[PDB]
Amino acid sequence: PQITLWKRPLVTIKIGGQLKEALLDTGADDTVIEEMSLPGRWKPKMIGGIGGFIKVRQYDQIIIEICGHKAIGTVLVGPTPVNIIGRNLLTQIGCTLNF
Amino acid sequence: PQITLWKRPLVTIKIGGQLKEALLDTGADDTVIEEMSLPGRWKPKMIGGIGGFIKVRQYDQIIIEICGHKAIGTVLVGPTPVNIIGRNLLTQIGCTLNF
């Protein structure tokens, strides 16, 4: 679909059978989700944002449904203000910016 | 144009008669430019995201050219790691998310 930006581009995502709200963020390299439980091992990762850096846990090959589209990729879990869908998964659902 | 998200959506912009690079950021409510001088009155503001908040100077009705598309809006100047074009200006150039 087409999403204008007059308001925050928030969509419903499904990760682990539980629905959540996430922001489609083109300004984000990676997908960062708020603290929750994900299966498998994780690796350390540091990510930078507007306010500074935060430590996050990196989970690979995680199944996540974004707006009806199924993506399977890297998901970072940590202290983020809001759930964000970064470019790593936006490319999986075939999302582009247009003007 | 259509911008894919395989890598950072960076574009050339013109603000205050200076050419700069900025990120097309749908995850940003505002447009935040790295420390520079802009004319007019300004008021302090606190903006947050990953890693916390930063204090910025809010300038209103500032003209910016983004990819040959002229727009006008509020521009925040402060210690941002990268120049970001937020939804307040993204909408003005007719930018949308498509998939």
Q: With an 8 Å Cβ cutoff, are B97 and A48 in contact?
A: no
Elucidation method: X-ray
A96-98, strands of its sheet edge to edge: A2-3, B96-98, A96-98, B2-3
* CA terminus-to-terminus distance, chain A: 15
DSSP string, B3-49: E-SSS--EEEEEETTEEEEEEE-TT-SS-EEES----S--EEEEEEE
Q: Which of A51, A80, A95 sits opposite B53 (nearest CB)?
A: A51
Task: Report the candidate in B63, B67, B57 with the shortest Cα–Cα distance to residue B16.
Answer: B63
**Å between A62 CA and nearest CA of chain B:** 19
Q: The tokens 């925050």 sit on which residue?
A: A8
Give, for B74, the enclosing helix (H) or strand (E). strand B69-78
Chain A CB contacts of B7 under 8 Å are 87
Q: CA B44: distance to chain centroid?
A: 17
Phi-psi region of B26 (alpha: psi -120 to 50; beta: other; left: phi over 0): alpha
Q: Are strands B84-85 and B18-24 parallel, antiparallel or unpaired?
A: parallel
B11 pairs with which residues across the strands? B22
Q: With an 8 Å Cβ cutoff, are A99 and B97 in contact?
A: no
Cα–Cα distance measured from residue A65 to residue A16, given in angstroms and rounded to the nearest whole number: 9
**Å between B17 CA and nearest CA of chain A:** 23
Give, for B60, the enclosing helix (H) or strand (E). strand B52-66
> Alpha-carbon dihedral of residues B79, B34, A49, A91, nearest 10 degrees?
180
Strand segments, DSSP code E, in A1-99 are 2-3, 10-15, 18-24, 32-33, 43-48, 53-66, 69-77, 84-85, 96-98
Q: With an 8 Å Cβ cutoff, are A5 and B26 in contact?
A: yes
Q: Which of B24, B51, B98 sits opposite A50 (nearest CB)?
A: B51
Domains and CATH numbers, chain A: 1-99 (2.40.70.10)
A25 is catalytic: yes
The token pair that represents A56 in the structure block = 């996050």
- DSSP-derived secondary structure letter, B87: H
Q: Taking the CA of residue B43 as centre, how many other CA atoms within 13 Å lie in the half-sphere pointing to its CB?
A: 2
